[PDB]
């Protein structure tokens, strides 16, 4: 619940800044906005690509840390770690 709330807020903010910066960079706009142009399942797939390296994921570090901490706790609960 909370993780997706934060992700949605961050994606809205990044879309707003891309819309602000398209006038400076119209050429960059296409593959900047491809993420918003992608279907929602593929959007969440791109946003969930920071498990190992893969910095192309637009997700910020302050949300990556939340997901990694919860994943560590889940692995500990499952006894895998």
């Amino acid at each position: 619940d909370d993780f997706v709330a934060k992700l949605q807020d961050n994606q809205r903010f990044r879309y707003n800044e891309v819309m602000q910066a398209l006038n400076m960079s119209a050429a960059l706009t296409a593959r900047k906005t491809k993420e918003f142009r992608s279907p929602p399942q593929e959007q969440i797939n791109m946003l969930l690509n920071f498990k190992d390296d893969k910095s192309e994921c637009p997700c910020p570090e302050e949300i990556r840390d939340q997901l990694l901490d919860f994943h560590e706790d889940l692995m500990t609960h499952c006894g895998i770690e």
Binding site: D1, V4, L7, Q8, Q11, Y15, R37, P39, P40
Partner: peptide, 19 residues
């Protein structure tokens, strides 16, 4: 490509669908 541009991003979906 106007429809492809305006197609709803993840932040427009209801919270439960995105969850």
């Amino acid at each position: 490509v106007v429809a492809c541009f305006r197609m709803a991003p993840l932040y427009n979906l209801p919270r439960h669908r995105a969850v």
